[PDB]
Amino acid sequence: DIMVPSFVYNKLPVIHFLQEKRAEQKLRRVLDETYTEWTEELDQAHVTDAITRSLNI
């Protein structure tokens, strides 16, 4: 009735703060893993050059 409730009450703030920090850490890790991917595709100039070779020009 008295002791355990008082100690739980004393615990509450630190746990709340630590859990808030943990959530912010999760969000930060989520953000840090985002990178914009740039893909390289075969230049069409080579395709045009090959077309010329097929044209036998």
Next chain:
Amino acid sequence: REEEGLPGGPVPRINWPQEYSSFIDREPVVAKRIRYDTLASTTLERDEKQIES
């Protein structure tokens, strides 16, 4: 270019009367005329619907 009927293929800025006169033996320059003329008589375009597909 297709509303004036102008030839699709690209055309270099050349004066063959000068090229004929500039060179020594005809065969090299003679061959040059064939390539560019052949190039100018073709349309270098593709069906982008299939390419996109």
